[PDB]
DNA sequence: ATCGGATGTATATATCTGACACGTGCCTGGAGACTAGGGAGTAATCCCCTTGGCGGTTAAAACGCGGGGGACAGCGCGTACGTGCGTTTAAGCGGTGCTAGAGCTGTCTACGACCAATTGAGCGGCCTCGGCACCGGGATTCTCGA
DNA sequence: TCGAGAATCCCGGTGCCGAGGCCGCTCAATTGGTCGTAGACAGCTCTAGCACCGCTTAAACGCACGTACGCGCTGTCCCCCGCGTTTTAACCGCCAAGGGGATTACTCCCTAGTCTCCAGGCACGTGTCAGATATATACATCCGAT
């Protein structure tokens, strides 16, 4: 019988518990730790992937290229606070031009 | 309580002396307010982590060792308290 | 509608405020100040009604009469007095050998008040002749017992301090039904209190096994003398283990609300599904005293440490309510135009559920 | 004494201070300030004399560092005066915008 | 030569994406980057919680310590949302 | 065409939209080979590995440039200068 | 009243070995305790994570070698690794 | 450029006091002996792939010129600040009482590791079909000098 | 305020390899007990952060002012760049190989764990002097005079 459906989450819980048990983070763990971790990873993954899909439909492309993920992570501010010193392969950079460097004439 | 006073508790000569220990001479008169601001925004995070740490330990007093623990969590380490 | 989703500030007409309760649909607030006075605030109108100089020692509980003419107060100095809502003076004065926990008025019998003395059986004091009738209990007579009416007050339910719950009649006192709570796995458990609703005859029970349970006031007289415990949902908090102090029922009959002590975690569920739906974000530092929703409209209002915090549904009607034939909406479709372009002599004279907790008759415009 | 030229006594003040080892902000105002700011996160907390002491030094440390950085960028500005925009420049370039 | 079996967080995040937007495809590179991200955050939180548990002379890892860790690590109202969601998940799991 | 400074904006925007690498494969690979031979001889590189290093470089490098940029703005000029690069490297806290 | 652990006697003897004329105050004791602890957790954690990298269940001396070479700066790392190798050899030769 | 005068700068002389360094006790860890059992290395292997190399070219680099736009030096200026002094004021020791809280200890009960086997979640192989790359050309928008 | 030329966007129009989905074949995740135990509750002890006040003065307050320089403006001149050219090896796609990285199997030996006793390092007194504290002084420096 399964264990992920007991809480209705999607990320595995048995896998998390086994990997944390063999990860020697401590010697003895409770029962709510694996389900709680599965839940928080679920929430963070959903938070990122919703913006990923929004960026995918921005350019009208079904497949999500990593550029979309880069834009979605960078344009948000809380992510930029949490993903401070992290880069992305093939990610690129969001467009930006300094304000005072903008020529004009009549 | 929340009081607008005691924020100016660092009166001008204290910042003067701190600037001197930094090694500057000519400081404009409009530096004091943003110094207060940056000091407050810095102190916010450390005091918040300290109170969370002391709360998790089920006691309502804060020591110094948990303070240096929070400081090391941010990245700035203190030596001389254990 | 649904659970409250907005946040309201505080309602502090005076600095101190200990207890609060709604009358029938949240009309007036019964503040028992910690100075020996009884203050009445106005709800849904944000005002005050009357201040009563009761006595010296402050009080700790409040309730109003079925006819709304009395202000009963479970005093901390054993002053079982019937303060008048109208004049503010004392109508009936009496003294009890034990203080009172839970004061209530039967919506069908205001003569017999609800008293919960400690280390002694509950006593109904009749306001017509100042006579005290002891509620017959079972086994011990020195336990921390709490007595409470049903929806209609027709049966009275008492909870003891060893694991025994008693069922008897509010007026005939025919103790013919008992109940034994489950003994966990090895050790027994006492009962802290019970709390009822206004529809469905359900009631929560708060015990010493750190777990809040729920029963219905229909399976004890049906089973007979004593049967096997069988709750619907053994709700509890399994991440912090917060103890439970005060918790009431919903203003609709389908929700369940539970209150913390210092953690500012106000939990809510529904009777249909025991799954958490929302949690309250309270600012830490104060102890919760009383909780009781609007008995009709979904809202939460918790008193704590002399102040009150309300999480509500603040509403203002949309700008598009100028006239039924006038709307202020946005659309990008072409307008759909219209497609369909007596004499009598009679004067005009015409001008949860409802119970009998009305007729406060207390309102002073000046 | 006599009306000295600006910055002249500043140099000897620097020399007296930069070699010194002491606390520059007073004690009572700072402990009162931290007790005031602690209220928002949680009320009715008790501090330890050893604790709060520690704190100020760390803060001073950080604050001192800031001036250092600002001074250098001030020299990069072809001026001796310190201006607010340089503080924001240092804060942003350090990595904690 | 000898084929090997490897574990990646590939199926679960794909199911999440379908549950959210059942109309958009994903790339293998995005799959690997999401796998790396989830491994990263998992290790970060677990290690911080473990060293906190050692800090408190506790030989166990309860569920409370993890929520303390996510209060410290996660900034802003995202922390409140995540901790509320975790409490919801555990409460819905226990009585089953 | 003419009007210098106009073509720069078009080029910079065009490249800002694009997200490809900027260093030819073979020269960078040979340079990594040389700097590895400096440490130890006869090291076999994974074609995936080299690529890896490659990307990280630009990341680091581009960040540096941006910082120097704002530093030039602090000096009432548009052109960036070597001195600003040492400014950024020292002020970052990585000397 | 109770039993508490510290590094007081050992650092004192090390001081007396090299400068048998200079005293220290309690603040020096506390700061040296903090320094030696801090470096101990840093190097020990690095060694643990190295051991976990290569799916190995043990931490031996050569793991400490790799950790010290990786973490400390160059010349001090060379001195430290030389002295440690000398110590381990003289320990193993005379067990 | 050169010299005299007020003034903070670092130095030597009593001394005294509380923190520094030393001698005692003994109990809790660590070193001495022994075991078994599970990690590990060491022989062997064989197919994946990384190094090496070759033909074609063109996209990219390399080099020269014309000039205009921006870096750089200077000059006035008037204005914001550092210096100086008389005055009030809250910091800084000083010393007092205690309750509120931290901290240590006996306890005993709900809770996590061991383990056996299952058996379905889950990982790998093969088409495959369409999302997307490649391409050819017309419609669409920007810019600067007459 | 208005053209010529010059770029980019988009509408087809077409061809191709990557995400996908099904089939087959495993291996570790539950379930249920089972067993030992780590921490939770209640009590008692002690000790110090806090409320409180007294008196003293180092320092903050704020005015006065005389000038150092931040800044706006000018002129200057010099070199970065864009446009054009010629020039060439990065890149593409194709070959072939050997070697070594990852896998299998195995015997052997390092170590967790237990038991064992004894010894050394922290709590605790206790004597004593290193440097702060206040006094008088030669000296180097900012300022002012020529």
JSON list of N, CA and C in Angstrom, two decimals, chain C residues 274-314:
[
{"chain": "C", "resi": 274, "resn": "UNK", "atom": "N", "xyz": [-12.77, 16.64, 7.82]},
{"chain": "C", "resi": 274, "resn": "UNK", "atom": "CA", "xyz": [-11.84, 17.06, 8.85]},
{"chain": "C", "resi": 274, "resn": "UNK", "atom": "C", "xyz": [-10.49, 17.47, 8.32]},
{"chain": "C", "resi": 275, "resn": "UNK", "atom": "N", "xyz": [-10.48, 18.31, 7.28]},
{"chain": "C", "resi": 275, "resn": "UNK", "atom": "CA", "xyz": [-9.26, 18.80, 6.66]},
{"chain": "C", "resi": 275, "resn": "UNK", "atom": "C", "xyz": [-9.12, 20.29, 6.93]},
{"chain": "C", "resi": 276, "resn": "UNK", "atom": "N", "xyz": [-7.92, 20.72, 7.29]},
{"chain": "C", "resi": 276, "resn": "UNK", "atom": "CA", "xyz": [-7.69, 22.12, 7.59]},
{"chain": "C", "resi": 276, "resn": "UNK", "atom": "C", "xyz": [-7.90, 22.96, 6.33]},
{"chain": "C", "resi": 277, "resn": "UNK", "atom": "N", "xyz": [-8.55, 24.12, 6.50]},
{"chain": "C", "resi": 277, "resn": "UNK", "atom": "CA", "xyz": [-8.86, 25.01, 5.40]},
{"chain": "C", "resi": 277, "resn": "UNK", "atom": "C", "xyz": [-8.11, 26.33, 5.50]},
{"chain": "C", "resi": 278, "resn": "UNK", "atom": "N", "xyz": [-7.94, 26.86, 6.71]},
{"chain": "C", "resi": 278, "resn": "UNK", "atom": "CA", "xyz": [-7.22, 28.11, 6.91]},
{"chain": "C", "resi": 278, "resn": "UNK", "atom": "C", "xyz": [-6.73, 28.19, 8.34]},
{"chain": "C", "resi": 279, "resn": "UNK", "atom": "N", "xyz": [-5.71, 29.03, 8.55]},
{"chain": "C", "resi": 279, "resn": "UNK", "atom": "CA", "xyz": [-5.14, 29.29, 9.87]},
{"chain": "C", "resi": 279, "resn": "UNK", "atom": "C", "xyz": [-5.04, 30.79, 10.06]},
{"chain": "C", "resi": 280, "resn": "UNK", "atom": "N", "xyz": [-5.23, 31.25, 11.30]},
{"chain": "C", "resi": 280, "resn": "UNK", "atom": "CA", "xyz": [-5.19, 32.67, 11.61]},
{"chain": "C", "resi": 280, "resn": "UNK", "atom": "C", "xyz": [-3.77, 33.11, 11.92]},
{"chain": "C", "resi": 281, "resn": "UNK", "atom": "N", "xyz": [-3.39, 34.27, 11.39]},
{"chain": "C", "resi": 281, "resn": "UNK", "atom": "CA", "xyz": [-2.06, 34.84, 11.59]},
{"chain": "C", "resi": 281, "resn": "UNK", "atom": "C", "xyz": [-2.17, 35.92, 12.66]},
{"chain": "C", "resi": 282, "resn": "UNK", "atom": "N", "xyz": [-1.95, 35.53, 13.91]},
{"chain": "C", "resi": 282, "resn": "UNK", "atom": "CA", "xyz": [-2.03, 36.44, 15.03]},
{"chain": "C", "resi": 282, "resn": "UNK", "atom": "C", "xyz": [-0.65, 36.87, 15.51]},
{"chain": "C", "resi": 283, "resn": "UNK", "atom": "N", "xyz": [-0.56, 38.10, 15.99]},
{"chain": "C", "resi": 283, "resn": "UNK", "atom": "CA", "xyz": [0.70, 38.65, 16.47]},
{"chain": "C", "resi": 283, "resn": "UNK", "atom": "C", "xyz": [0.98, 38.15, 17.89]},
{"chain": "C", "resi": 284, "resn": "UNK", "atom": "N", "xyz": [2.12, 37.49, 18.07]},
{"chain": "C", "resi": 284, "resn": "UNK", "atom": "CA", "xyz": [2.42, 36.82, 19.33]},
{"chain": "C", "resi": 284, "resn": "UNK", "atom": "C", "xyz": [2.56, 37.81, 20.48]},
{"chain": "C", "resi": 285, "resn": "UNK", "atom": "N", "xyz": [2.19, 37.36, 21.68]},
{"chain": "C", "resi": 285, "resn": "UNK", "atom": "CA", "xyz": [2.43, 38.14, 22.87]},
{"chain": "C", "resi": 285, "resn": "UNK", "atom": "C", "xyz": [1.28, 38.23, 23.87]},
{"chain": "C", "resi": 286, "resn": "UNK", "atom": "N", "xyz": [0.10, 37.74, 23.50]},
{"chain": "C", "resi": 286, "resn": "UNK", "atom": "CA", "xyz": [-1.08, 37.89, 24.34]},
{"chain": "C", "resi": 286, "resn": "UNK", "atom": "C", "xyz": [-1.78, 36.54, 24.51]},
{"chain": "C", "resi": 287, "resn": "UNK", "atom": "N", "xyz": [-2.59, 36.45, 25.57]},
{"chain": "C", "resi": 287, "resn": "UNK", "atom": "CA", "xyz": [-3.32, 35.23, 25.89]},
{"chain": "C", "resi": 287, "resn": "UNK", "atom": "C", "xyz": [-4.79, 35.39, 25.51]},
{"chain": "C", "resi": 288, "resn": "UNK", "atom": "N", "xyz": [-5.31, 34.42, 24.75]},
{"chain": "C", "resi": 288, "resn": "UNK", "atom": "CA", "xyz": [-6.69, 34.47, 24.29]},
{"chain": "C", "resi": 288, "resn": "UNK", "atom": "C", "xyz": [-7.65, 34.12, 25.42]},
{"chain": "C", "resi": 289, "resn": "UNK", "atom": "N", "xyz": [-8.70, 34.92, 25.56]},
{"chain": "C", "resi": 289, "resn": "UNK", "atom": "CA", "xyz": [-9.71, 34.71, 26.60]},
{"chain": "C", "resi": 289, "resn": "UNK", "atom": "C", "xyz": [-10.99, 34.07, 26.06]},
{"chain": "C", "resi": 290, "resn": "UNK", "atom": "N", "xyz": [-11.68, 34.75, 25.14]},
{"chain": "C", "resi": 290, "resn": "UNK", "atom": "CA", "xyz": [-12.98, 34.31, 24.66]},
{"chain": "C", "resi": 290, "resn": "UNK", "atom": "C", "xyz": [-13.03, 34.37, 23.14]},
{"chain": "C", "resi": 291, "resn": "UNK", "atom": "N", "xyz": [-13.74, 33.40, 22.56]},
{"chain": "C", "resi": 291, "resn": "UNK", "atom": "CA", "xyz": [-14.05, 33.34, 21.14]},
{"chain": "C", "resi": 291, "resn": "UNK", "atom": "C", "xyz": [-15.51, 32.95, 20.96]},
{"chain": "C", "resi": 292, "resn": "UNK", "atom": "N", "xyz": [-16.19, 33.62, 20.04]},
{"chain": "C", "resi": 292, "resn": "UNK", "atom": "CA", "xyz": [-17.58, 33.31, 19.70]},
{"chain": "C", "resi": 292, "resn": "UNK", "atom": "C", "xyz": [-17.93, 34.04, 18.41]},
{"chain": "C", "resi": 293, "resn": "UNK", "atom": "N", "xyz": [-18.35, 33.30, 17.39]},
{"chain": "C", "resi": 293, "resn": "UNK", "atom": "CA", "xyz": [-18.58, 33.94, 16.10]},
{"chain": "C", "resi": 293, "resn": "UNK", "atom": "C", "xyz": [-19.89, 34.73, 16.12]},
{"chain": "C", "resi": 294, "resn": "UNK", "atom": "N", "xyz": [-20.16, 35.41, 15.02]},
{"chain": "C", "resi": 294, "resn": "UNK", "atom": "CA", "xyz": [-21.50, 35.92, 14.77]},
{"chain": "C", "resi": 294, "resn": "UNK", "atom": "C", "xyz": [-22.42, 34.73, 14.54]},
{"chain": "C", "resi": 295, "resn": "UNK", "atom": "N", "xyz": [-23.50, 34.59, 15.31]},
{"chain": "C", "resi": 295, "resn": "UNK", "atom": "CA", "xyz": [-24.32, 33.37, 15.21]},
{"chain": "C", "resi": 295, "resn": "UNK", "atom": "C", "xyz": [-25.03, 33.20, 13.88]},
{"chain": "C", "resi": 296, "resn": "UNK", "atom": "N", "xyz": [-24.90, 34.17, 12.97]},
{"chain": "C", "resi": 296, "resn": "UNK", "atom": "CA", "xyz": [-25.52, 34.09, 11.66]},
{"chain": "C", "resi": 296, "resn": "UNK", "atom": "C", "xyz": [-24.50, 34.27, 10.53]},
{"chain": "C", "resi": 297, "resn": "UNK", "atom": "N", "xyz": [-23.61, 35.26, 10.65]},
{"chain": "C", "resi": 297, "resn": "UNK", "atom": "CA", "xyz": [-22.72, 35.64, 9.57]},
{"chain": "C", "resi": 297, "resn": "UNK", "atom": "C", "xyz": [-21.30, 35.18, 9.87]},
{"chain": "C", "resi": 298, "resn": "UNK", "atom": "N", "xyz": [-20.61, 34.55, 8.92]},
{"chain": "C", "resi": 298, "resn": "UNK", "atom": "CA", "xyz": [-19.24, 34.08, 9.19]},
{"chain": "C", "resi": 298, "resn": "UNK", "atom": "C", "xyz": [-18.26, 35.22, 9.48]},
{"chain": "C", "resi": 299, "resn": "UNK", "atom": "N", "xyz": [-17.72, 35.22, 10.70]},
{"chain": "C", "resi": 299, "resn": "UNK", "atom": "CA", "xyz": [-16.75, 36.21, 11.15]},
{"chain": "C", "resi": 299, "resn": "UNK", "atom": "C", "xyz": [-16.11, 35.65, 12.42]},
{"chain": "C", "resi": 300, "resn": "UNK", "atom": "N", "xyz": [-14.89, 36.07, 12.73]},
{"chain": "C", "resi": 300, "resn": "UNK", "atom": "CA", "xyz": [-14.24, 35.63, 13.96]},
{"chain": "C", "resi": 300, "resn": "UNK", "atom": "C", "xyz": [-13.78, 36.85, 14.75]},
{"chain": "C", "resi": 301, "resn": "UNK", "atom": "N", "xyz": [-13.99, 36.81, 16.07]},
{"chain": "C", "resi": 301, "resn": "UNK", "atom": "CA", "xyz": [-13.67, 37.93, 16.96]},
{"chain": "C", "resi": 301, "resn": "UNK", "atom": "C", "xyz": [-13.19, 37.34, 18.28]},
{"chain": "C", "resi": 302, "resn": "UNK", "atom": "N", "xyz": [-11.89, 37.46, 18.55]},
{"chain": "C", "resi": 302, "resn": "UNK", "atom": "CA", "xyz": [-11.28, 36.87, 19.74]},
{"chain": "C", "resi": 302, "resn": "UNK", "atom": "C", "xyz": [-10.79, 37.97, 20.67]},
{"chain": "C", "resi": 303, "resn": "UNK", "atom": "N", "xyz": [-11.16, 37.86, 21.95]},
{"chain": "C", "resi": 303, "resn": "UNK", "atom": "CA", "xyz": [-10.70, 38.82, 22.95]},
{"chain": "C", "resi": 303, "resn": "UNK", "atom": "C", "xyz": [-9.46, 38.26, 23.62]},
{"chain": "C", "resi": 304, "resn": "UNK", "atom": "N", "xyz": [-8.55, 39.14, 24.01]},
{"chain": "C", "resi": 304, "resn": "UNK", "atom": "CA", "xyz": [-7.26, 38.72, 24.56]},
{"chain": "C", "resi": 304, "resn": "UNK", "atom": "C", "xyz": [-6.59, 39.90, 25.24]},
{"chain": "C", "resi": 305, "resn": "UNK", "atom": "N", "xyz": [-6.19, 39.71, 26.50]},
{"chain": "C", "resi": 305, "resn": "UNK", "atom": "CA", "xyz": [-5.31, 40.65, 27.21]},
{"chain": "C", "resi": 305, "resn": "UNK", "atom": "C", "xyz": [-5.86, 42.07, 27.21]},
{"chain": "C", "resi": 306, "resn": "UNK", "atom": "N", "xyz": [-7.17, 42.20, 27.41]},
{"chain": "C", "resi": 306, "resn": "UNK", "atom": "CA", "xyz": [-7.81, 43.49, 27.48]},
{"chain": "C", "resi": 306, "resn": "UNK", "atom": "C", "xyz": [-8.16, 44.11, 26.15]},
{"chain": "C", "resi": 307, "resn": "UNK", "atom": "N", "xyz": [-7.67, 43.57, 25.04]},
{"chain": "C", "resi": 307, "resn": "UNK", "atom": "CA", "xyz": [-7.99, 44.08, 23.71]},
{"chain": "C", "resi": 307, "resn": "UNK", "atom": "C", "xyz": [-8.78, 43.01, 22.96]},
{"chain": "C", "resi": 308, "resn": "UNK", "atom": "N", "xyz": [-9.21, 43.32, 21.74]},
{"chain": "C", "resi": 308, "resn": "UNK", "atom": "CA", "xyz": [-9.96, 42.38, 20.92]},
{"chain": "C", "resi": 308, "resn": "UNK", "atom": "C", "xyz": [-9.44, 42.45, 19.49]},
{"chain": "C", "resi": 309, "resn": "UNK", "atom": "N", "xyz": [-9.27, 41.29, 18.86]},
{"chain": "C", "resi": 309, "resn": "UNK", "atom": "CA", "xyz": [-8.85, 41.21, 17.47]},
{"chain": "C", "resi": 309, "resn": "UNK", "atom": "C", "xyz": [-9.94, 40.53, 16.66]},
{"chain": "C", "resi": 310, "resn": "UNK", "atom": "N", "xyz": [-10.34, 41.16, 15.57]},
{"chain": "C", "resi": 310, "resn": "UNK", "atom": "CA", "xyz": [-11.42, 40.67, 14.72]},
{"chain": "C", "resi": 310, "resn": "UNK", "atom": "C", "xyz": [-10.85, 40.38, 13.34]},
{"chain": "C", "resi": 311, "resn": "UNK", "atom": "N", "xyz": [-11.06, 39.17, 12.86]},
{"chain": "C", "resi": 311, "resn": "UNK", "atom": "CA", "xyz": [-10.83, 38.82, 11.46]},
{"chain": "C", "resi": 311, "resn": "UNK", "atom": "C", "xyz": [-12.21, 38.66, 10.83]},
{"chain": "C", "resi": 312, "resn": "UNK", "atom": "N", "xyz": [-12.48, 39.45, 9.80]},
{"chain": "C", "resi": 312, "resn": "UNK", "atom": "CA", "xyz": [-13.84, 39.66, 9.34]},
{"chain": "C", "resi": 312, "resn": "UNK", "atom": "C", "xyz": [-13.95, 39.64, 7.83]},
{"chain": "C", "resi": 313, "resn": "UNK", "atom": "N", "xyz": [-15.09, 40.10, 7.31]},
{"chain": "C", "resi": 313, "resn": "UNK", "atom": "CA", "xyz": [-15.30, 40.31, 5.88]},
{"chain": "C", "resi": 313, "resn": "UNK", "atom": "C", "xyz": [-15.78, 41.75, 5.72]},
{"chain": "C", "resi": 314, "resn": "UNK", "atom": "N", "xyz": [-14.84, 42.69, 5.62]},
{"chain": "C", "resi": 314, "resn": "UNK", "atom": "CA", "xyz": [-15.20, 44.08, 5.37]},
{"chain": "C", "resi": 314, "resn": "UNK", "atom": "C", "xyz": [-15.72, 44.21, 3.95]}
]
